[PDB]
Amino acid sequence: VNGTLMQYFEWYTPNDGQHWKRLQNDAEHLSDIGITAVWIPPAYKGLSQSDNGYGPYDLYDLGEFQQKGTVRTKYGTKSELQDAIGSLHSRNVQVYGDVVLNHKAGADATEDVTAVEVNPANRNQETSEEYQIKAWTDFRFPGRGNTYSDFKWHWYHFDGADWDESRKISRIFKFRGEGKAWDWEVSSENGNYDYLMYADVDYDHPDVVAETKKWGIWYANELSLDGFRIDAAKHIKFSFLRDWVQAVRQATGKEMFTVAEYWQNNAGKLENYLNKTSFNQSVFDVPLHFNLQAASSQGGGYDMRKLLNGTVVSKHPLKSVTFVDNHDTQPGQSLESTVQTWFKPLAYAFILTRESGYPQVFYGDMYGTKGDSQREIPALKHKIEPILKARKQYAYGAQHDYFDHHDIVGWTREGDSSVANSGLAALITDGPGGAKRMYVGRQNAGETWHDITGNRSEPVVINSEGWGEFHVNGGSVSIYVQR
């Protein structure tokens, strides 16, 4: 069966402590529609109860210790999470955990540290003389004590921070100490993009490297995870990420599929990341997200023949995770660049019914977003579910592409004799509707095919040579399959 990932959260999920129970209750539904793996949000204790998990305080607290004024995380308790994972696994759905290793947030106390300021546009350049600051770097875990790990964090485990508690000023501070320097290799944007936010972990420090590998193995084992989503990969030493993934795989004996978030609209830089990590993990296809967004926002003027230009999926199809939108590109968020609603079903047909890429469905697109703008994403599950059914049951076999018009483009799948009645013909258009003659395979000659989306009511008959004349409405999608 075709694999399909689902990101199971949106930025504005409520702080009601019931998210793990929601997931548990949705397991049957997710398996029924064709989801084969779920990416869950960071499940460890953040600097406050309402943190989404990207300001992680204690990686060993999965919602069971009294820290930061709460036992549960935003999403629920550890036992609730283990019950959700149990329900998914009983329905043959895998679970990938989000891993936030670039920084730590919410230190228990400050420490005195010697530091220099650096140029925000070129972090290799020092711009001040050294001086003393008070940085938030002492992590003691008073609610956990030494349960699971007795490692405590201090300033010397970090490379820098962006807040001095003594003068109350925000600058990028690089710490002074033995062999201190920004890590390499990382993105060369801003000269060196190791520093992002909070207290930056030093992956040159051998105890830190060793402890982080130990945590990785503990986390995969405690929750029985099947893979990972690596946060902020452009900001973490590439050879460390390569080796950390290898160490967890070696210790568990599992495949541990891994996808890294390397946020850059440039395939060449993404290819460098793949090379530097020995092709041992996939990346999200950022360039394809931006091509889909561009097509959705040009009112029909985009040249649809160019949708695959510059994308990771056109060059490295087995190492790409394709997506339409996520918790950062949704309205009001940090990487806001939402695919407009009218085009969203066409974008989902493009990533779910083509042979290359491992597609991701976004929670926010299925169930709607609950942010406070006048442009939230509406719930589109009724439009996406028929496309997921097309992937689950019909998108198999040889593919033929028809990117030969500036508005109307399409592709077909001949089907596979081992999946009964498989085969499909998809057409999308960013402009007026029309038709296209496409080949679906002589083995499907004389069959009656119909649009599974319900957008067109007229069925199409495949001629004796394996060709059909397919139609599509304006600004729409049609996916024809065996009636």
Ligand SMILES: C[C@H]1O[C@H](O[C@H]2[C@H](O)[C@@H](O)[C@@H](O[C@H]3[C@H](O)[C@@H](O)[C@H](O)O[C@@H]3CO)O[C@@H]2CO)[C@H](O)[C@@H](O)[C@@H]1N[C@H]1C=C(CO)[C@@H](O[C@H]2O[C@H](CO)[C@@H](O[C@H]3O[C@H](C)[C@@H](N[C@H]4C=C(CO)[C@@H](O[C@H]5O[C@H](CO)[C@@H](O[C@H]6O[C@H](C)[C@@H](N[C@H]7C=C(CO)[C@@H](O)[C@H](O)[C@H]7O)[C@H](O)[C@H]6O)[C@H](O)[C@H]5O)[C@H](O)[C@H]4O)[C@H](O)[C@H]3O)[C@H](O)[C@H]2O)[C@H](O)[C@H]1O
């Ligand atoms: C989002 C994306 O970002 C990056 O992408 C960039 C990209 O790489 C770049 O290229 C560019 O992109 C271009 C593109 O290339 C172009 O082509 C295209 O066209 O345009 C784009 C541009 O749009 O730009 C991109 C954007 O910059 C990155 O590459 C991606 O990977 C990334 N995506 C992923 C990564 C993420 C990060 O993990 C996710 O980000 C999300 O979450 C972030 C974290 O929440 C969020 O960050 C923002 O918000 C943060 C809050 C902020 N932190 C600062 C704030 C601080 C304090 O608030 C500060 O904290 C320090 O100081 C505190 C003291 O004030 C101290 O706390 C102590 O005191 C307090 C009081 C104590 N708490 C007490 C209170 C209580 C509560 O009642 C009690 O509970 C408690 O008991 C009590 O004690 C505490 O205990 C004390 O410790 C702290 O300790 C101290 O650390 C901090 O240091 C500050 O940094 C961030 O800076 C801000 O950025 C992001 O916005 C979210 O998006 C993302 O989701 C991932 O997918």
Ligand SMILES: [Ca+2]
């Ligand atoms: Ca370093």
Ligand SMILES: [Ca+2]
């Ligand atoms: Ca870093």
Ligand SMILES: [Ca+2]
């Ligand atoms: Ca067009």
Ligand SMILES: [Ca+2]
């Ligand atoms: Ca057939």
Ligand code: NA
């Ligand atoms: Na670092």
